[model samples]
Target chain A: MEINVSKLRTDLPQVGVQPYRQVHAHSTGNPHSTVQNEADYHWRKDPELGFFSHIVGNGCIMQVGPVDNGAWDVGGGWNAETYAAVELIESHSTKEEFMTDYRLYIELLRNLADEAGLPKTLDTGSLAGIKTHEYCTNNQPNNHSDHVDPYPYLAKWGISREQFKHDIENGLTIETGWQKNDTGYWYVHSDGSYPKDKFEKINGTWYYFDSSGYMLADRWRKHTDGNWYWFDNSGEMATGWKKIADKWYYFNEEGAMKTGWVKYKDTWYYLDAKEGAMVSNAFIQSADGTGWYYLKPDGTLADKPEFTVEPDGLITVK
Target chain B: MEINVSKLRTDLPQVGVQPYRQVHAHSTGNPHSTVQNEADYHWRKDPELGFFSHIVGNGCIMQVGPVDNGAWDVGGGWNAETYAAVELIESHSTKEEFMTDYRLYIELLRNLADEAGLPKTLDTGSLAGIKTHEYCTNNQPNNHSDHVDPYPYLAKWGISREQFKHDIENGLTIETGWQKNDTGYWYVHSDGSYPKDKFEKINGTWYYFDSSGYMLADRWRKHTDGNWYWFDNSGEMATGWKKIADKWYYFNEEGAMKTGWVKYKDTWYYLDAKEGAMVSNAFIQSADGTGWYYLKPDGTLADKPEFTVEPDGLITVK
Candidate 1:
């Protein structure tokens, strides 16, 4: 995907220094007055053409492309007070891990915007793609041209009527994710689309997978030792599970089923129980059978109370 | 006095510009996720140190110096909104005009912050200052000397807590005068003192006023009627009053007076009247004798209702 920030002026390279000082001095030679020409234009005037995606005169840009397709905009409603922009994507096997991946993306963009001197009043976020701008604007599928703002998307990134106008005029693009059903994906570039085959390098190892369940590893190594291990996707020990094990899980303090597994000394251990064998230090369904509880390796429940599912079906302690 | 910011860093000379642009940029950056640095700190960070004459780290900034002193703190019911330091300064001005000046200052600073690559979420006028930060251990005025927050200053800037914290922190300053009592004055510099008295040039003309009132000029010029007139305080003309015999009277638009003698084109015209003869345009007391109304030059009463002074001596038009 390509980011069309060519509209940004090349005169200055990303304003490594405070451009306002120079701009203000240039426009008004008053040292005591702190007004800058650039700020004057953005806040009051229109954005200069052919530089930066921020088009002057457009309504405030709330969300971009590549979104989540989840039941919720995210774990919670998009925090308008925070100016968060939510995107939803799709991916069945990766549903459980979706939040984790999106979180990393959010953090990265936040840092970038900060470096770019963007204000924090703009909060950006994403949800699994249960909604999209098109869906919100037109309320129809495949109606790519529709201008509706997705509820979840809007929830995360609300804008004032004036700001909306500014974003539209500027054609501001936000970081978004792409999805198909349960397979949610995001691209690094603002305008880039997530490809069908998804892969990412984590901790010096590469993991690749496709919807057809094709998994491949190259130069990946697994490290393991006495009762502890690293989940390495490149080594033979990682095996085929790397394709579906998109989430990180482990047995609770109480021995029970936690979900995925990790590797230690080239040996694969289930995060919870696998193949009818109970893993040491695993999670177990509590006596009440309402939620899973952590257990010590000695097969005793931890001192903490047992876990219980809330009305939302997420695990919590009782 | 000149500000030698260049002493702080060699690059400072290059950054010289209007100070408020820094404040505006800082205010604009509040809402976005970003960090502030020294280069544009005044507009993007705490501005009191940069603009107003106030104790650093303490809320005690001299409002009008020794006698009519004033101090500000984060609390005192002041809420938060986005603004820059300079904007805050103007907002805190004791005059309504200065309040408006700070708003303009914020606009300038917002533009500067954008160009500076700082976060745009930084605002100065939107938070409950007293509530946001924990008070010092002692809670005494000076005991918490290190806890200086001008949130109240933000309130003076016309910002409310509903706006945002970051916006308030970076968006206010002292250029806009803060409100003051009838006997008090707002100082422009951090020292809380007025500008020194000295002869200065404004708009290409030299103007001088000493501790004593005195006219200093020597010239003679011809009037429209070809009469010679003494030129004092430059060749400026007196558009109104004229001398007749031994008394003075005001001239009418027609160049005539009810009681006066004036020269025109080398001719001296004379008229007679009592010591307090009233002109046709003279004002008449209201029927209630509580107010005065002026007659038009054409000798007709003004086409408006009568105004009256209340028992408390306050004027109200009926």
Candidate 2:
């Protein structure tokens, strides 16, 4: 997240008052120019182009003009009011380059937003926040054309605006760990830290949180309901019928322990969905409510009828 | 591009409206649930949960509900209007898994869009065409917010709505080559076909295109303007000063020919930017415009005062 701002150039021409309302982003459109070459172009060749306030290339932000000054970047009203504009000089030849540039872009935006006292959020529609050059052109038709959307340009690099916004928001927060705020819900920050809590629910499945708040891996944890559940290192709760010790149990959609008669693949199996136990050595009505069936001590439904239902609806043992 | 459609189930409850208009995309949220498990949950557990019309996982699309009927996917008005609500069953364990599933999702969306007679474009603001669950919630306020935005969910996989749209559009086209439609511009398709033209400009640098339409690489080509340009295997045009066959030459920003008193690194040299040749045995004004300099027959700028300039812009050799 370290941005090398030492390369910021001071030669760019100055302009009028900049409202610091939105950040307009553009691509250099030159796929072969490096940061040095791009800076040279902006300085030695087209100093009066009035394009960008800052140029980002090779994972660094090169300040061309003051952020407080308006630059003729986005056409229409945006060029006159927006505070900052940047061109991502894409000379990247690999995925690593793309990622590095992306990280730098996020860092630069975050820093600029902080400096400008703007909200950390991104609003693509209004002049209220960060906008792409394409967004301004598409929305502000009177002063701009619907031409030159950067989505396709960024798409060639496999970068998306949604991803860009997401990175900008997340990259601003350096905290790592299961830190719960005023909200009761828990979250796992993958920044190499774990929570100290013992239990947490992710996507509705209960998991055993390690001492460091990291979810336990491939371990069994007994819930308050006396039900045992197994979670993998990936924090995925095991589902369907599973054996714990000598007994078999079933987990429902909620990963809750299930019991009694369970139907799986058109076959009825006796399970103790509760207490992580199974029912055995008992005669019970079939899941279809039609016939009486018996279960062995092992919780297996009797293949042959060990009991018959009498006319009075009473179970009679053979 | 071949999708296995044999798993399409027939028991989904039917609904009204056969002319599908929109394709609503959602994330399963459960990072470990496969398409089969999600379908099972929808069918046997909670048929009324009203989640999705189709489930995509493991690089295939599983139809839980038909594309023609509406589902309770996007919420509010979208539930009754939008078609083909699908969940990206993100059970991926690696980057490869994510990309595979992504490719499949793009293919599925393209197919559905074609079938629904919808335009091959993304309209995030309008309810007229394709929509993401988050887009629906943000824009269609009345019907959405039943779920969290999937931006963070997909961010884990480095996927974005823009990349999704790009893939969906590109996945429909199968040809690879230098295709020049009615437009005069040229493009390089990675699918192994080259253009038949001899010249093309990509992002501004002129390149020598071969007869097969492939840009020549690591070779020199003489343009009609009597200038020779060298291109690398990456198809980037060489610029600045270069030495070819012991001869010095200079290329301008457009990779075009250059000649006469070229200033490089505060030093003056004479070059024929055209013909890949250098000027020899000539007296020229100094690059600093203060004196005169001479070049040897071997195209080397002379160090001694080999030339003299009388103030009236006249040059004389020593």
Candidate 3:
């Protein structure tokens, strides 16, 4: 019997008691992966993903797919990490047994990283390119077909092994910004650029929203407009665009990327969108003696804004 | 009229004021020098001996005297110092008068000594050989009596004239010795010698008793026995007995002639006694190599006490 153990609603409800049977069948004869056994089904489920699990014996007989980063999970409260795990499990689990083993392995690795003071984010490139057992046969190389584990995908945007190992060996310490008022809020800037943007409420929960009020990444954006961002563990950025820049690029209220505006002479210019690729989702700006220089993705000067035009322009960003 | 103030005892029925007056007359005219008044009666029996008077309006009279140190007359206590004649007449009046100016004079002189920062006992001496008219003749230099004042006598034993002068110029200050024990007594010898006798408390009155328990001065003897007697205040014999020669000779225990004892030849000697007087009030044995020297009345010693005898002694002292 097929089961849907990780689901909270009413579809194939008996899968809650017999998820392995269906999962094994789904993974078998599919070439993408092999079927997993019920004995070690936890290796396949990888429950860091947000879902309401209905357990059956060694693992969930049925499972749900990716939960959004900011959406409420089984335990309430939104976290990008929860969504990251969900994305990893749903696409990788080939069979019930393989899924169980893979889930258990990921849980073990996460716990070890936590103990070593590693960042919650992962770095798959340095993980030797081995696909989870749930997505491939015992001695198979990287070609595990459609059963690809998304851990590598999330790691692309999370933390890296080098940074994690460095922090673990050298000890992790964080420098904080100056406090503002008595609210325990501090203003921090990533770069030493003058007239730098100011950041507040660092290392704390902040709401993310776009101009249309859509929260694109829940509380994922570290830096806000006019501010700086900090990491619990220090190193190069494990994920995202322009990670080396210490200061934050601006984000619209709806949480859309809008940073890297540069002012030259007296005019402003968009740093990353000259060929009209619709203003880049990422950008970086550097301050010069003449003014601020906005560099495009191709590393050239873009056109300046209309108000008080110079070769470059002052970029008022949020 | 004359009166013998000492004999007119109000507590006794046998001595009438008249017989008392006659007895006083007899005592005053005896072989010893006597003070005589205008009536040719002994001055001690003169009715006005201790009184004062001031005439009032026709057929009216007022008198005053016998005020204690509480009177401003003698420059001390509560005498009528600031009161003018008109103020006095308008106040207490002349007919109703006080008797016995002795207390007034005593109070006055005490006040003067206090104002002068001189001891009353020592000041009494300087009042002698001076006429009363010269003292109180006018409101000028002789406004008070020209009689000798003895405040300086007692003052010299405890304090010096320079100290008194400094104190008076700065305003008189009362100094009290810190009483370390429960003893409510203090003592000083007039000749700067040790107090040689204990004060006896009989019927609640204190009396100076000699070492032999004798009250008569002739019966008393210094430690020198036949060489020094207590009566002569200035005789060399008396002076010889008072010289301090050792450490123990300095204790002044209130009224006791001597309270501290010193060790000599394994025995303690009375320190307050004359140089050679043997004493038995010792409580400790002397250390080795110590003995009493044979000191003569001429301030010469035949031997030194620190280098004298061993432990054994010839005779025992009580």
Report the lDDT tens digits of candidate 1 across residue range A91-198: 212322333323333343343334434432221232211222332323322232333332232223333434433442243444543322353223332233333344
TM-score of each: 0.16, 0.28, 0.15
Deviating ranges (above 4 Å) for candidate 1: A1-318, B1-151, B154-258, B263-318
Candidate 3 lDDT over A116-179, as tens digits, reads 3334333332322212223332222333234333334323434244543343234444332432
Candidate 1 local lDDT, B19-137, one digit each (tens)? 21222211211322121222334334443332221111111121111111111222221111112222223222244443443344444334434544434444323221212222211
Compose the digit string of candidate 3's lDDT tens values, residues B118-185: 44342122322111211222222323433222223213234344543343234343323211225223
Q: Where in model 3 is the C-alpha error above 4 Å?
A: A1-74, A77-318, B1-185, B188-318
The residue ranges of model 2 lying beyond 4 angstroms of the native Cα positions read A1-318, B1-9, B15-18, B148-150, B169-318
For each of the candidates, the C-alpha root-mean-square deviation to the true structure, in angstroms, is 46.5, 46.3, 36.2
Cα-based RMSD of candidate 3 = 36.2
Q: How good is the docking of model 3, as DockQ?
A: 0.00
- The candidate scoring highest on lDDT is 2
RMSD of 1: 46.5
